[PDB]
């Protein structure tokens, strides 16, 4: 198991892509993975060590270019629209 | 002037009680936009 970086994963056949992290969720002993209000997986129980993991996506939206206008200058700034640098 | 000021000061107190006891026009815009999004997500399956 590797955590805090984007990976493909498969736990016991439950398959996906995302950043796995340690979790505060408390599954009952028979429950094996968790879902949100939109019915998509967001948590999983590790089959080896029975600890709870969160899942989070890897797809992060716009890149936007900020310009003085080319009449004024050719230098620019760039916005990564939802990213922690 | 004193009567008119008292009526005004009294009337503001009623607004505060009414709001602390609705905003349906705003709330149902938020609800409509959440419904459209959850419906978009449901269409994937």
């Amino acid at each position: 198991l590797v955590k805090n970086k984007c990976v493909n994963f498969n736990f016991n056949g439950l398959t996906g892509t995302g950043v796995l992290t340690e979790s505060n969720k408390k599954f009952l002993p028979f429950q094996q993975f968790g879902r949100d209000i939109a019915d998509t997986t967001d948590a999983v129980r590790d089959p080896q060590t029975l600890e709870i993991l969160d899942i989070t996506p890897c797809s992060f939206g716009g890149v936007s270019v900020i310009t003085p206008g080319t009449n004024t200058s050719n230098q620019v700034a760039v916005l990564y629209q939802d990213v922690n640098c | 002037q004193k009567l008119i000021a008292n009526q005004f000061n009294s009337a503001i107190g009623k607004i505060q009680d009414s709001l602390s006891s609705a905003l349906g026009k705003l709330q149902d815009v938020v609800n409509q936009n959440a419904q459209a999004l959850n419906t978009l997500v449901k269409q994937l399956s």
Binding site: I37, A38, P57, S59 | L23, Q27, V30, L37, N38, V41
Partner: peptide, 24 residues
């Protein structure tokens, strides 16, 4: 502000308003 009251997987995103609530 008290009285009035996540799908990131699917390419859905929410953009901040230009003005913040403190500006309004």
């Amino acid at each position: 502000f008290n009285k009035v009251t996540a799908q990131k997987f699917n390419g859905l995103t929410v953009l901040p308003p230009l003005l913040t609530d403190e500006m309004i």
